[PDB]
Design a protein around this ligand. Sequence first.
Ligand SMILES: CN1CCN(C(=O)c2ccc(-c3cc(=O)c4ccccc4o3)cc2)CC1
Ligand SMILES: [Zn+2]
Lengths: 161, 47
Amino acid sequence: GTILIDLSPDDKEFQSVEEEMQSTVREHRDGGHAGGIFNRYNILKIQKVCNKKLWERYTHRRKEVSEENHNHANERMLFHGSPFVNAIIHKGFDERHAYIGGMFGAGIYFAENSSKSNQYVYGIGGGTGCPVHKDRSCYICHRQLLFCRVTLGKSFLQFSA
Amino acid sequence: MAHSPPGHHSVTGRPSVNGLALAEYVIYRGEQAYPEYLITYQIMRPE
Ligand SMILES: CN1CCN(C(=O)c2ccc(-c3cc(=O)c4ccccc4o3)cc2)CC1
Ligand SMILES: [Zn+2]
């Protein structure tokens, strides 16, 4: 039930999503080991992900959270980079995506920095890099990120290095 | 999937050394995220 609709580069919605992508690149403490070396991206395509059932599933849970938190879902737009992006757009997020070795326990991780999510496109630590060239800094191969609507509700604050 | 800390719906990972890093977040229910945009891109080699 998922359909992907292409946005035009002339669309304000394309432009605002590209800007959040571009403006949230930072340098990483691994010197580029995991996601590669770059200051900016070449955006090739932005598609809106449309699934009525997955949407209604998200809005139902959003209402539950909101009602537990003085009518405040605390909703954010955040990045997610994963080898399992195809499973996510078709089936949604679920417990099979829980990151067992994650520093905040077995959950699903999102980033404000697009470049942090980029570090996971080809797997934990960048895996072995792109399928074609085995290069975590490949400048040729097309990569994919999700820009996601995320319900935080009341969030537990972990101060960390 | 672990549980959210009692009384909370998510965890925020605040950066406390790298002053330029933005926050990271963790949810423990798949229904608390919707994958709204799929972005296809290349990283660009700095000049
Ligand atoms: C079932 N296991 C899920 C975790 N695995 C992942 O490959 C995985 C994919 C994406 C992420 C991911 C994706 C992110 O976008 C992200 C952003 C901030 C901090 C951490 C982040 O981690 C983590 C792990 C291995 C399989
Ligand atoms: Zn490649």
